[PDB]
Amino acid sequence: NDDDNTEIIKSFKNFILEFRLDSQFIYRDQLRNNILVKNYSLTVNMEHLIGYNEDIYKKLSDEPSDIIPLFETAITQVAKRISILSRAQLLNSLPTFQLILNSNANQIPLRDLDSEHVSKIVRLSGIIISTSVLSSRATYLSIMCRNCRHTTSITINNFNSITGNTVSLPRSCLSKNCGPDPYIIIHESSKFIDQQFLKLQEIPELVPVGEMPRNLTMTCDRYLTNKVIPGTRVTIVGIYSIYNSKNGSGVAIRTPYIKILGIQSDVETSSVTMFTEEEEEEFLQLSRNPKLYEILTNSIAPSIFGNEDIKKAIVCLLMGGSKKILPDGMRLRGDINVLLLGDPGTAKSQLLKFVEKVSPIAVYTSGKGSSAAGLTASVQRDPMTREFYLEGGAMVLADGGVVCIDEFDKMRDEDRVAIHEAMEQQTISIAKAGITTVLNSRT
Amino acid sequence: MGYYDIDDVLADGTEFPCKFQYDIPGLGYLENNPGRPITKNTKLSLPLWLARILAIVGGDEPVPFVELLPPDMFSTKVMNAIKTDPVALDLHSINSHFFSLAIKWIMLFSEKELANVVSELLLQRAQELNHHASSLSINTNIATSTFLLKLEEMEKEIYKKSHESYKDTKRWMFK
Amino acid sequence: SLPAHLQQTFSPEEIQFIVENEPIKIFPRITTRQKIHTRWQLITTDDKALNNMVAMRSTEVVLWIALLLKQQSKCSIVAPQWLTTKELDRKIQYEKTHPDRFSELPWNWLVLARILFNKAKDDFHDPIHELRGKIQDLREIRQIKVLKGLKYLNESHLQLDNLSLLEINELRPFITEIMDKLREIHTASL
Amino acid sequence: DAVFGDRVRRFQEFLDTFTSYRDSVRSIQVYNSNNAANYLNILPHRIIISLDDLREFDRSFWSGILVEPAYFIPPAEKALTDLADSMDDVPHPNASAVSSRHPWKLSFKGSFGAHALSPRTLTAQHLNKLVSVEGIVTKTSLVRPKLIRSVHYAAKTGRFHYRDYTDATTTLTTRIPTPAIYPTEDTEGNKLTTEYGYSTFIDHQRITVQEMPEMAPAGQLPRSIDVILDDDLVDKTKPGDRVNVVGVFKSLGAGGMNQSNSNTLIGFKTLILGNTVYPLHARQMLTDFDIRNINKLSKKKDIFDILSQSLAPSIYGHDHIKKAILLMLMGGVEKNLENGSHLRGDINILMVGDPSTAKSQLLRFVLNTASLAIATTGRGSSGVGLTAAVTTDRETGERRLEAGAMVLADRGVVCIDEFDKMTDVDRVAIHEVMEQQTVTIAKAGIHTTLNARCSVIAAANPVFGQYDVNRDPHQNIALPDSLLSRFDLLFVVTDDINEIRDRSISEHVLRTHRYLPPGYLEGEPVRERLNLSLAVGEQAGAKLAKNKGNYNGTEIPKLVTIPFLRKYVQYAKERVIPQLTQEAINVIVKNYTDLRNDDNTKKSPITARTLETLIRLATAHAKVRLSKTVNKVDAKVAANLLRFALLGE
Amino acid sequence: YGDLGNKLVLEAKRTKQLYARSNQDVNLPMYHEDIIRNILKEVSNLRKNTEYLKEQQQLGMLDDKVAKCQYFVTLLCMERNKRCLLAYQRLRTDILDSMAWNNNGLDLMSSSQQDTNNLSHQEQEYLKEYCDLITDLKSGDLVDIDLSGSLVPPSDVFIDVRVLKDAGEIQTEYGVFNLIKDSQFFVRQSDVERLIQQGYLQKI
DNA sequence: AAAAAAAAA
Numbered sequence A: 001n002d003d004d005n006t007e008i009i010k011s012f013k014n015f016i017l018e019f020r021l022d023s024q025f026i027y028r029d030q031l032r033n034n035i036l037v038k039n040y041s042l043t044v045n046m047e048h049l050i051g052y053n054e055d056i057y058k059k060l061s062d063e064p065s066d067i068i069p070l071f072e073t074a075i076t077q078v079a080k081r082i083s084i085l086s087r088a089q090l091l092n093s094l095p096t097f098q099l100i101l102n103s104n105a106n107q108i109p110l111r112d113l114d115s116e117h118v119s120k121i122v123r124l125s126g127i128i129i130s131t132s133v134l135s136s137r138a139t140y141l142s143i144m145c146r147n148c149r150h151t152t153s154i155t156i157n158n159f160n161s162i163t164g165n166t167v168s169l170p171r172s173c174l175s176k177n178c179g180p181d182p183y184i185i186i187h188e189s190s191k192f193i194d195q196q197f198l199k200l201q202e203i204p205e206l207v208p209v210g211e212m213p214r215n216l217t218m219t220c221d222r223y224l225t226n227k228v229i230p231g232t233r234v235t236i237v238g239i240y241s242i243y244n245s246k247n248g249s250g251v252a253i254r255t256p257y258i259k260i261l262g263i264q265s266d267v268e269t270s271s272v273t274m275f276t277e278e279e280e281e282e283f284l285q286l287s288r289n290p291k292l293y294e295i296l297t298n299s300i301a302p303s304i305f306g307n308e309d310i311k312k313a314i315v316c317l318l319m320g321g322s323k324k325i326l327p328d329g330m331r332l333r334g335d336i337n338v339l340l341l342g343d344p345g346t347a348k349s350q351l352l353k354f355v356e357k358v359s360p361i362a363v364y365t366s367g368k369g370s371s372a373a374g375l376t377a378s379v380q381r382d383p384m385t386r387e388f389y390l391e392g393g394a395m396v397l398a399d400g401g402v403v404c405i406d407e408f409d410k411m412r413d414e415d416r417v418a419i420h421e422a423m424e425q426q427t428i429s430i431a432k433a434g435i436t437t438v439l440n441s442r443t
Numbered sequence B: 001m002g003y004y005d006i007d008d009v010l011a012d013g014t015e016f017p018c019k020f021q022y023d024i025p026g027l028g029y030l031e032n033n034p035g036r037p038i039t040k041n042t043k044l045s046l047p048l049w050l051a052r053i054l055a056i057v058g059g060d061e062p063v064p065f066v067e068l069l070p071p072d073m074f075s076t077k078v079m080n081a082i083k084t085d086p087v088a089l090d091l092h093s094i095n096s097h098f099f100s101l102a103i104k105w106i107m108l109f110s111e112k113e114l115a116n117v118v119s120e121l122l123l124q125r126a127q128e129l130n131h132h133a134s135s136l137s138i139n140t141n142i143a144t145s146t147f148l149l150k151l152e153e154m155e156k157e158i159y160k161k162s163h164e165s166y167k168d169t170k171r172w173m174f175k
Numbered sequence C: 001s002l003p004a005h006l007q008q009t010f011s012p013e014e015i016q017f018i019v020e021n022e023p024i025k026i027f028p029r030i031t032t033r034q035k036i037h038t039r040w041q042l043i044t045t046d047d048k049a050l051n052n053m054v055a056m057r058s059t060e061v062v063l064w065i066a067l068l069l070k071q072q073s074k075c076s077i078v079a080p081q082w083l084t085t086k087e088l089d090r091k092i093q094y095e096k097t098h099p100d101r102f103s104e105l106p107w108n109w110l111v112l113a114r115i116l117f118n119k120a121k122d123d124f125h126d127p128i129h130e131l132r133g134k135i136q137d138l139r140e141i142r143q144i145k146v147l148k149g150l151k152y153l154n155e156s157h158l159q160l161d162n163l164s165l166l167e168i169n170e171l172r173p174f175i176t177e178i179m180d181k182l183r184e185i186h187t188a189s190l
Numbered sequence D: 001d002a003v004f005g006d007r008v009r010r011f012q013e014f015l016d017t018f019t020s021y022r023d024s025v026r027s028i029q030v031y032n033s034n035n036a037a038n039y040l041n042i043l044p045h046r047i048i049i050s051l052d053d054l055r056e057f058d059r060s061f062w063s064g065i066l067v068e069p070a071y072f073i074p075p076a077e078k079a080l081t082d083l084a085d086s087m088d089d090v091p092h093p094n095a096s097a098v099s100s101r102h103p104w105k106l107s108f109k110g111s112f113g114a115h116a117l118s119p120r121t122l123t124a125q126h127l128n129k130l131v132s133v134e135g136i137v138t139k140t141s142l143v144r145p146k147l148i149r150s151v152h153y154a155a156k157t158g159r160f161h162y163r164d165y166t167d168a169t170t171t172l173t174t175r176i177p178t179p180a181i182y183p184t185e186d187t188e189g190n191k192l193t194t195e196y197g198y199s200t201f202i203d204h205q206r207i208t209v210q211e212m213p214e215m216a217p218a219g220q221l222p223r224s225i226d227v228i229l230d231d232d233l234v235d236k237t238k239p240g241d242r243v244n245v246v247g248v249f250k251s252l253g254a255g256g257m258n259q260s261n262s263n264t265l266i267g268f269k270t271l272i273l274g275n276t277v278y279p280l281h282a283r284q285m286l287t288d289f290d291i292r293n294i295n296k297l298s299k300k301k302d303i304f305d306i307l308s309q310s311l312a313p314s315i316y317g318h319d320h321i322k323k324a325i326l327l328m329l330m331g332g333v334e335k336n337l338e339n340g341s342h343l344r345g346d347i348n349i350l351m352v353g354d355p356s357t358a359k360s361q362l363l364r365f366v367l368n369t370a371s372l373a374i375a376t377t378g379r380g381s382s383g384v385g386l387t388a389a390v391t392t393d394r395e396t397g398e399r400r401l402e403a404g405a406m407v408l409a410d411r412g413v414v415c416i417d418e419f420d421k422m423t424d425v426d427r428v429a430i431h432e433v434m435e436q437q438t439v440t441i442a443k444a445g446i447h448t449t450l451n452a453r454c455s456v457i458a459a460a461n462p463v464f465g466q467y468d469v470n471r472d473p474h475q476n477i478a479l480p481d482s483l484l485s486r487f488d489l490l491f492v493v494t495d496d497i498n499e500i501r502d503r504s505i506s507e508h509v510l511r512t513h514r515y516l517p518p519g520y521l522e523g524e525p526v527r528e529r530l531n532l533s534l535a536v537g538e539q540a541g542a543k544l545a546k547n548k549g550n551y552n553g554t555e556i557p558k559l560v561t562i563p564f565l566r567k568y569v570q571y572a573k574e575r576v577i578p579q580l581t582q583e584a585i586n587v588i589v590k591n592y593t594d595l596r597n598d599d600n601t602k603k604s605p606i607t608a609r610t611l612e613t614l615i616r617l618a619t620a621h622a623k624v625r626l627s628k629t630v631n632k633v634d635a636k637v638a639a640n641l642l643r644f645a646l647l648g649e
Numbered sequence E: 001y002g003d004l005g006n007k008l009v010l011e012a013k014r015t016k017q018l019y020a021r022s023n024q025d026v027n028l029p030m031y032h033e034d035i036i037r038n039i040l041k042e043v044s045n046l047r048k049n050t051e052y053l054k055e056q057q058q059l060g061m062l063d064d065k066v067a068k069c070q071y072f073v074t075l076l077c078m079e080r081n082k083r084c085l086l087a088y089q090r091l092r093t094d095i096l097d098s099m100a101w102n103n104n105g106l107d108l109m110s111s112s113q114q115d116t117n118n119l120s121h122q123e124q125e126y127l128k129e130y131c132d133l134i135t136d137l138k139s140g141d142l143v144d145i146d147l148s149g150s151l152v153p154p155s156d157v158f159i160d161v162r163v164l165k166d167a168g169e170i171q172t173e174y175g176v177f178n179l180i181k182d183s184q185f186f187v188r189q190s191d192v193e194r195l196i197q198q199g200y201l202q203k204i
Numbered sequence F: 001a002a003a004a005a006a007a008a009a
Ligand SMILES: Nc1ncnc2c1ncn2[C@@H]1O[C@H](COP(=O)(O)OP(=O)(O)OP(=O)(O)O)[C@@H](O)[C@H]1O
Pocket: A303, A304, A305, A306, A307, A343, A344, A345, A346, A347, A348, A349, A350, A351
């Protein structure tokens, strides 16, 4: 039982210590650079693992949830080996290292997931619609008894592979005549990590005919948290597993969910500067071009013919102005507004979608299917605890970017007056059900 | 102290609080009404390059014309803040030429309690500087950038030189 | 020369040049012993070895001459003693058993290694990858020891008994600047 | 084992080293003794230590406190209690009160470094560590006492027994749980009667603090954390207050690791045991030379014009608006009579004008410079939820009223934008407040009258896109006259086109935009900054550093800074209560009679309530110059301002 | 008053960054002599004021302390302005010599800025004088050494070279090279360094 | 109990 685990750990250690192409051991230097900056994590490219040996890839693809903790403890063993001197024999504050995977396999649409993808590694893409608040998870628990009153420690991993996975309390004491489970939890001298929940929605253009989009639930932990914001297209690599809901129709039902292993995002969470040196040099070189203005102006909607001043206005809007502040506290606006008011057939709507696509943060909405309460701030109540809480609309979702509104005249007169302050001062004030909050929205 | 040094020249331009220890008729013409003389104990914010010499000239009881008040940059609060945890301190906001002005201030006024604390501060920050410099990519979290934006003006030169040295060594090593 | 700040420290190319300006042993493939023919008659190397030479015998030449002959089929570079597994094992054991002393090692460390692995690939009796891995492990150990030792920087002096050329060069600017700053701070304080 | 004693004696050594805390403790003791039997305030047994001195004394203990307070604070508290017991000297104590056993809990102040966080920054690796968090008070719970130690007596034995109870939130260290079962029988079966008046009960309240929405990530809602505090400081502050709370951040509860869990994804509960609370206020006490300077400025002839000009220096013109705002921020006194009931005391101002004439900016300035103010938008508010709400508390299971927007602004000022766009229904909710400054809630079995004595300032647009000077003033304003008659001052502003004014305002606005923050270059945008270096903060009269106010020279007339003006307002609103005299009465009656019988066109009709406005304006102007009597000059200036606001120059 | 002078010096710092980040001699920025001559005009006004003040001091109606303090203040003003101007010009001359020393002293007008008109006429004549000095320096006892040659140590004898620009045929010692566009040579390293420095060859 | 969307008057 234990020998196979040791063999697998040894195989992974040999892989990580031996993998070199040309004259560089890439993973060891990656570990060094990660430890030096206090980022106890490692990234494995799947193609390298396949090329090194196929049996390890086969085992990982067969039972991922069981295999992965062995790899993630081999990583920390190697890190302690290649970072700490034994000195013929301390702090040793190195937790279990996080494993991150990347792959280039075929994508699978959300609606195509079925009973045959249970406990398998899958890759898929979607849109982020909501992020949950972070929560704590125990990893090393100090357990104390009452009658015999001794000390014990429990080590728990985050992978489950099954609904239970939980050793709540050992039956009987450790050897007089104590109870069944006479233990408590010593909250001090305990170690905790962080977990977060996310909701994913199907990409609009792959929705089947005459259907509505489907949502799914994903869970991430440690360094993968606090990475994605609502409204960002992402590519996820994870495990499609199921968990029971004893609190919650039918018989023997099990709600599926996704455990996040790796996230790729187009924006790369850049919006302080994090760009590569080569990219910064390329941007400076492009800015040195004597005719960058015409190059960018031609770039705005190349399939639209004739409009020039409109394209210049679009470029000036996307670039944006300069925010200013004053000693007495008065704010000054730093955005530019463009209104297109013309005859039909002049391709007004085709520019809006292109501007939405270009901008890093943009939302496209119609003035007909919209409401004043549904744009700035919606006051909802939790069905469980019955408490008022504030849910954002569309204008707050596009803060720091641009908002695309078409058919501005069809919008109701009552609705169109709410945007007055939201643009004249870029701050919205809500006084509903005793909630008095000033919310920021710059767009 | 180099005549043709840009950084020293820039650091010489900061303003220090000071007070007119002596009353001089006809002064203040460069700040207020020229015909109105400046009275005694008048507080002003003067640049270093003249406050240093006007406070030592004397002129003539050979009291100098101006007396330099303790600047707010060197206060007990900052001393406690740097003594508590210097590695995480955002010393860039307090000043951009902090080290050079500290050198000049300690030169004008010998204070054995400043050299040791400043030395310990920079010694502690140097290890983090080297740790970040040795971390060559093979693209980073928020910690590296948020430390890098807390740096002093002069520390950037050390960081860049170390990074270039390590990059050159790595480039020559792997070919 | 100036080139910005390149007047204060050596470039890695200069380090490689100064290292490769060193003697080495060679097993020649040809013979040019004088008929008892053009004299080598160099100006910065003993030509007696190059002129009085015979095949399948040991002799000492400068490293760059050995490399030039290795580019042709006139050379067979003899590997040094410290490029073998049985010596590197006792070496790594020495560093592991002694957590305070830098091990004795020639100052041409890592550089002769890079050059020999680059050019003299087929003349090693031991497999190349194992030797490269052992060298990498030694590099990691010495890096850890250097980081451990750097934690204290006195303003008076410092001692580093067994650091190679590249290790000294890659650390010179940071240590030099920090020590200069500390020294001038102390000097201004008194 | 013995480490507790070692820490206790080390802390005793540290306490003996510094002699300030001993002086404070003996002062508290002597004050408490004097409060006992001499012909209602008592000092709590709490002392605040500055951990800077602790760090300067012993770094090991300082680090132990700031990393793992669970093993360091209790020994310090025990040592402090032992010192207090040793120094105390009471020869004839009481019976029930002697068994209180207050352990003299501590409070901290000084630099925290990396342990001063925000509600969003709190994460897993900051657990079990002393922290200090800034934020805004969202909502509070009800004060409910909880048991600590019970006292029992048996008639047959005649021996008083006691049993002690503790919970997870009671103490920093986890211990074996004890239920609330009352011991009623002895070991030999003797009856035990619970003795009230000898047992111990401590107050308990829970509050929730929210991160400030101003410093939030783009497109992210604010997040909040909850704080538990007990015993002293149990009912400090209120919802809608900026606070800094220092305490221990620890987890509690099994959190599903027992058999009660239903699903895999079970998270723990986190909570902060607050140690101390400080008012942030983005300080509030005048110094001696501050009072000297205030008197020296008030004895000048033209202080009021200087103060009016000092308000919002980046707004061109509108000088009378600035004077009106100055008089409104420090309005007249309220009157109560045994037969006349109550008389309104403050001033409300309404402005109407065509777009782009700098009304909202002045409103924001008034928000920033006021002691207390609340921002409200007409469209984004509901009248029923503006005054009070009904919410069921999760703990007690009962429904209690939650304070509305205007109630929080009691004795403050409320600014409403887009007032004319605000729903007609909710308008009546405003009128009630304008009637008697009291809101009555009679719903779901609660009948209560809530005090709300605030002033309201609003700005509204005319019915048309631009003001029509040739039309009826009632025609241009959508609001009914019933509420318009309440406002004391009505202002109409128009952007008359004139090339001279256009050039002047263009030069001014261009001058404003060419500004650079001190010490920061112009090539890069503004970057966020960290908190203050000091978590909790705190030669005279010869410097005038910020007393004179003129930061930059631009005109012969003087200027004053915002902090000095706010200090002036704080001093004036408290230290002076002027009384009117007959000399101003004659002028007031003469000008009222003249204005009423001038018999010409006017912006609005006038009635008897305008004389009350004149009286309180004269009172406000008497307050401005810091006099206890009202002079005729105040009547003259009030009449001039009213004529400007109603006739026009 | 010399605050405007700081505006120059700060700008100079940015130039050093252009020298620093590039680590290469290219595109020296166009001068700022307008601010300099404004400073010269105001310091001339300062000198005139000082001479007038000294005149009144020698006349007798002026107080000695006022005269001495005004003289000290003005002298500090002149000193700081001169310091700023010299700090600018020293760096300018240093970078000028920097790119003058490596291009064989010919200034490479055939290829770097084209017209070099962003330099002042005084700076241009200084550049010509320094090129004259560079030409004279290797005309002494070091005539057999190319001082303006490569500074990378020679590491290999034969390299592959790929043609970058088209030309005819160029004679060498004992041979001739015809520069056909897009051709690859297998020649000696030390025979094509002059061409490589000029930019006619690529893929070292 | 309080906010928000829909069809008919
Ligand atoms: N200048 C143009 N160049 C190319 N195609 C154009 C141009 N103007 C209009 N079109 C074409 O007209 C069609 C309809 O355009 P679109 O619906 O965007 O017009 P619009 O002005 O937004 O209309 P509406 O006011 O009726 O909403 C598109 O297929 C678009 O390609």
